[PDB]
Symmetry: D2
Subunit: 463 residues, 4 copies
Amino acid sequence: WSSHEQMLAQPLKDSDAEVYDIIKKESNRQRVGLELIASENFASRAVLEALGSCLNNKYSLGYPGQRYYGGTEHIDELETLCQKRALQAYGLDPQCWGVNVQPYSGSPANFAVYTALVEPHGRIMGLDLPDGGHLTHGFMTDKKKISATSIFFESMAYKVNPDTGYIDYDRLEENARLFHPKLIIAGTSCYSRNLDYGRLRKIADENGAYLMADMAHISGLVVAGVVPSPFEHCHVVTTTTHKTLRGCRAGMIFYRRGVRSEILYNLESLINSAVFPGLQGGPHNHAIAGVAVALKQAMTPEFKEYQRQVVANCRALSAALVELGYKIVTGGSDNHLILVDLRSKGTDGGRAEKVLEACSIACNKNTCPGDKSALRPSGLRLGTPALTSRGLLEKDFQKVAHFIHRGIELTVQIQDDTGPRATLKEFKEKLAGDEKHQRAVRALRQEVESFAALFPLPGLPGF
Amino acid sequence: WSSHEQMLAQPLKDSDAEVYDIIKKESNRQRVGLELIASENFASRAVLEALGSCLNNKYSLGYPGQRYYGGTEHIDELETLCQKRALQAYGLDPQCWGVNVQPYSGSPANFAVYTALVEPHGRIMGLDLPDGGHLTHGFMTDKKKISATSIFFESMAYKVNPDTGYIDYDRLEENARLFHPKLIIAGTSCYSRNLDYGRLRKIADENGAYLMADMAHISGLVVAGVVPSPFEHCHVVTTTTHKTLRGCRAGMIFYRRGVRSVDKEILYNLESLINSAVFPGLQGGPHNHAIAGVAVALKQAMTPEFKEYQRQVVANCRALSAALVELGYKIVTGGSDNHLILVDLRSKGTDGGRAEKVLEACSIACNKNTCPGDKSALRPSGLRLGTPALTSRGLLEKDFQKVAHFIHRGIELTVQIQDDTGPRATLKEFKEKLAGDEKHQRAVRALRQEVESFAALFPLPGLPGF
Amino acid sequence: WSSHEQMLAQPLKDSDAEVYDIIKKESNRQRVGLELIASENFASRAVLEALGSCLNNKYSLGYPGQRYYGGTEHIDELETLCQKRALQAYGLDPQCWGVNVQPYSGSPANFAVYTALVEPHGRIMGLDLPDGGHLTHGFMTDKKKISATSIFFESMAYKVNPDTGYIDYDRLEENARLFHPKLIIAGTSCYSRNLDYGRLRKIADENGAYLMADMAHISGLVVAGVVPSPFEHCHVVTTTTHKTLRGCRAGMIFYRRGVRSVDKEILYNLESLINSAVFPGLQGGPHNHAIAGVAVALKQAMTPEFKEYQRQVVANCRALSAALVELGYKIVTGGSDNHLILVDLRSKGTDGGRAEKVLEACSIACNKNTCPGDKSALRPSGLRLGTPALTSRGLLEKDFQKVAHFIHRGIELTVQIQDDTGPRATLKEFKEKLAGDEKHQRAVRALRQEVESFAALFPLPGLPGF
Amino acid sequence: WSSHEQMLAQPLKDSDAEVYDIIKKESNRQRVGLELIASENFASRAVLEALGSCLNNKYSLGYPGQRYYGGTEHIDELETLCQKRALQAYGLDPQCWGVNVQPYSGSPANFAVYTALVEPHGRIMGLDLPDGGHLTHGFMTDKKKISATSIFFESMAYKVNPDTGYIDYDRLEENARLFHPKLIIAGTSCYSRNLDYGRLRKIADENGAYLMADMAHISGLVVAGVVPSPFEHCHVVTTTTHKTLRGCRAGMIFYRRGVRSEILYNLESLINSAVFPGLQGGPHNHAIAGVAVALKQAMTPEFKEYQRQVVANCRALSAALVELGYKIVTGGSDNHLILVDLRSKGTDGGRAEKVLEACSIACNKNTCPGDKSALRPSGLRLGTPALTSRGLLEKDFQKVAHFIHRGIELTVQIQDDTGPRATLKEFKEKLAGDEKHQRAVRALRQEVESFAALFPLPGLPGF
Ligand SMILES: *Cc1c(COP(=O)(O)O)cnc(C)c1O
Ligand SMILES: *Cc1c(COP(=O)(O)O)cnc(C)c1O
Ligand SMILES: *[C@H](*)c1c(COP(=O)(O)O)cnc(C)c1O
Ligand SMILES: *[C@H](*)c1c(COP(=O)(O)O)cnc(C)c1O
């Protein structure tokens, strides 16, 4: 047809006004808000351009040199290039390390590794969820298995010491001798400290287990050399490509090659087989191009500088909050985030996140090591990656600290009008249903959005 | 250091010349070639524009109803809109059907359903791979379990009758009574005929099993009303959004809501089990930019232009099959009801394994596939051919007849090379003969030229030559 | 307190009058009844004497080779002797066959083999229960797994052809290619014909599976050479020691040793895997008194008298079947090659469910069983009849013809009662009609008298009326 | 035939001379030896008579009131009677407790319970093997699963404190919150102390798990009221019928009936279904008769007296050994056995058991809580049930203590001639290959066998 020939060439603005409008409103919402959620960032224009390329059309099952279909000359150049930049970015010798770049995301990357090295019902140990662990590391209760990791495998968590906020390696070492894990996971979603990879490797070798690092949250810090690298002691390293690496959504699996002890590593073929034809079908080539572009950007001195600023910003933010009387779990941080214990102010993350949200300050609740209840998490997780990508510096994060402080005070107030004992649903009602309050929110929001508009919003020119 | 901000705003062309160059060469490769691989298509510009939006930066966990974090006012509008268009596009009453739009792709969508309704080691039955089934429907040998479906669940396949090329429903009905499946899969990767959903539903109900349709390959034909809908008898329907639906890569899970049976009645519990399996079960944050792309593709799929596109797709397949029959080729089941056909090359004394390589060198893309008969997977007898991609470029019946002759020229050439390599020669040797033999290499070059010239006559959908 | 020692030396008759009385009544019940249940027999006095020996007090763990504790000089002589007699009795070369004699019973013997060669969730194929298979070969429905074999492993049955009553090897061969079993079971609980071990071995080798024979029902016939031996084609053979072997309750596992295949050759690893599964895998200390009983039964089974007993067993079954055919009864497969027959009572308008109850009240023991046809398990059409027990009491062909008429009288009576209860009457009601109805109760009493008088004419093997 | 008619009536002595001879030699070996293996005993004549009855011929699938075959009038009387005596013997109200008497032995009884309440891959926790646990409670290494319990289910052990020799309940309570067991096992094969059932029940209820007691070793002590009963806090109790109960080999499963909390107990049908048709076929009726006879004997005042003597004998034996300078794990015992730590004499159980065996003194090696190696167990497990059934009293066990002591000295000697460092195979050679030694053995053996012949050997008149 003559009209069908152009339906395929019509711009989004004309083709789908409704979706186009939603993107515009979301673009604007991101501009006037303060993003403190530790897992978010702003991808560069170049990365986003690669996502909408014609690579979306190429279907290519398999791997370079092992393709099911033909016509993959350029797709091979792409994937090969992506793998080369991944090893390079982390300073890895291709004779000792290899990498798979097809995982659709972080969760799928972890699952493929378990499938490959652990097998159904094999034992896996990971940091407990309320102590800062991730769902894919295992999540189950006494009556039900929630995470797919816990459903298809046998997981058992290890905890942090509630008095220090640090991972209790001694207890882990002891429990591992009884549990007999086939794989131990070193990775976190809400832990402000570096992990003792060396100690974990010793514990893993003691039980004949593999040591897998999930560096999703610190992958960017690692490339820049701002926090120790897990590649020195781990057998496998998984990671997402967004978060601190600042790329598009996707995942990667790094695995050791060569001699293990003369015993040789068999990780490569097991992992590759698990990703495909095991768990996935055709790879998302447009996403692989986006990652390639993100990895090149991550190797620039500018990126290195960005990462140093990220950590500096976190330090300034934590210091400013301590000065305002806030308690930081473990007293501080070594990376991009901090867990703030709000008990030091008589409130909780559950109520605080809602008030701050209404004020255009995004962050999320999280349980603190102590916490005797998950229905009333004591802390707030705060991260600096996103705002640092917008150019905020130390002086800016001190102002951010005051805005957050204003928020906490407000959440406390809506709490003093409700009485020391009241449900979360009563609190939210008194929040949006009170002259002085919905009015307190409106005022703080205005100051927050004005301050936020002073900074550039990375991405495509203008949606 | 100051150039860090100038780094996040820099265009791809300046930021990464190497990747930019690869995209250009791939864009050009797609333009001068003839795409006959049944699972490929060309996504519209609008869809691709949605993929590179700022939706990439939004991390949301959970569903529109209950999210983990805040600031999802617009993400909720998006996902909700996407779900509404999905039900609408397939003519489904939201009181009887619901839909999850977060699966990252087709394989993940199927796996989430198994995880939800079957549970570890539960029994699943699907069409055998060499008979046209998909990996995610189960794949194992007597010594090893390859597909994740076969590793975490207990799968057993059902076959097609090798004499008719059709699915043997009688044998399936019998074997199901002994196997006791908890779920039966109705879906194919290389089957040219409609599926008897009604018959499969009866067999499923007989064993108390769920009937799941994987309509990935025909999802576009279904929307246009060109082939019967699986929503009439199935409990669950999974699908990819690319392939015939012509969207970006992603997956969707449709499930029934309301009353299942009586006596006094019992309700469907598919919704919460499936939603829980997708998240927090198997996935983390949804890819919102991909959900926007799907939304855009679903709106385009409801237009009369799309419906006309789908009619042309089937008409093209019919013309292509007729033209090949006229040239003496054997088509499994003798023909097709949809977008593809499986060509049995034994009728010409060669096989798909060698033919696909020669055709590839001539810029004609397609893939080998075993035929129902075939007593060996190392020497598949057929070639799977699809019309979706080329129809999106505007080819009509007369164009597919010309395509048929180009393919025929290719087969003749591969036969010439096969006779030159020997009898017990290996594919490895066949490919080397095709690579370093000026004689054949000259035949290839000539045919390639004609194929690429003919292909340049048609527009390549997408962005402005990117 | 001083009478404690006088307590450990006191005879059962004085020590426990109540138990002693029960044994007396049971001994008498066995004497005046006609035992036609195919799985029963009467163990010799010698065997029973070994069971009550001081071997009961010896706790030994491990095997003759390597034990956990000491003081096993004689226990080693015993187990070693038992293994030697087992191989000998079946004419097996110890260089090609080995045997484990610790299983506590038949079910445990099978389970240990599955545990050793299959592993959790491994695939196993066995004869379907309603077609004559045993529980330990797999038993599950579409909603629940009943047998431990079906709970810990993945089982799928194969069936007999309902028109011929024979095992459909063709369908099994086909289904095995799709199911991929790791082990196939050749053994039955209610099948009157010989098994085609050769054919099953070919099918097993085709799928790389092990072939395991469960010869529990025919172990005695095999020793005597009255039916073909499964040791010619199987990799493993399990069996109970009671039933036709006429020993005490226990089980044994025979496994091949040496070279399995070539190319350069590979060895059998069955021995250590099986031994490890029995102990320390599934069992603790072996029952030595039971191992002594088996040893004694194996020596008796190698005598010419035993061989003659086994020939009489088969001849009796043939006469019993012929006599029933003459009375108009239908026998599945038309006859038998061994010790039993499945009688299809549809040929008389009744079913095994009601017939077994009436016959029981007349002191004629047998059990119901579904026939290949049967469209319902709640109304089994047949009766399984065996001759081992009565042949051990000396009945000959002319005696089994009289037995046939008594059974016939029973069937006529159950038909009379069925017509009196109604059409859609329940078994519950059928049993109540048979219980509180002087008319039928008078018919029962009369037939019972004739049956018990005829049965008292024969000796009851075992101890002196105990 | 006329000769076949009598092959079945011929006595064992004439029918099978070879087997008959073996029984005679074994009967004699039992008479002249000193049985100190804690799991052995001598069954009464009455019990043995029931085993060789005509009950061996009756095939009866199912349970009373639920039979597959007919002609079970007396078999029903038997099983019913056996169940009634089992409940009675332990003072259980049939409205609150039920019992299955078909398990062929102890291991099968445990396995059926796991099959019924845990299901494939369900989690189970039991006392670690080297700390006194039993195989059926779980046994696996970092590379292989040995016990069927560990192969079909997911097991993890709990340990004893190596400094006190007692079960560390605190650590168990902590690990259970991470492991999430569906069932916890309270039972031992080599533990001289009573178990804190109350504490274990609290831990089980805390994780929603079932508490199962395996009282195999103390079932006789329990009936007599010499050690606390596990029926006060457990949901299920399994046991063998030999060992201290002094019956034939068989097993039983006791389970609670009635209201659990209005939630009702579902143990009965699950357990019955698992035993049959789940795991077993026809029950061994002759063994059920033997158990019935053993249960009646266990309820007599004479049996009660026997059990008091058993414990008194153990106390005297332990005191006499302490006086000779031997170390007893946990310092003593509350029951029929003791674990002797031979490190206090510079030798190990591995070597000592062999020397004592050569001297006609039966016992077995066992690791001590400390032990940094299973290939060189430090202790010897000694039990008094068997010898007490032969009439030994306190004064007799003091003499037994000296004989054992003489044995230890000899094992040490063969050890001083071999040098502080030598393999177990060299030691055994120097034992049987030395004039003074094989001569030392012969002498002690003579004294041991003479002393042993002074006591009656329970059982059948004379084989
Ligand atoms: C966020 C996060 C994930 C989830 O990533 P997805 O790409 O959303 O699937 C996985 N692992 C860790 C350690 C994380 O922080
Ligand atoms: C000895 C013992 C067993 C083993 O009994 P078997 O009857 O040999 O199978 C099981 N459990 C415990 C606690 C034991 O002491
Ligand atoms: C292609 C295809 C798939 C796989 O989809 P992916 O999106 O590539 O992961 C699944 N099912 C069917 C029926 C297909 O044709
Ligand atoms: C009877 C029978 C069994 C069961 O034996 P048990 O000793 O009763 O436990 C197993 N297999 C077959 C083939 C049988 O006939």
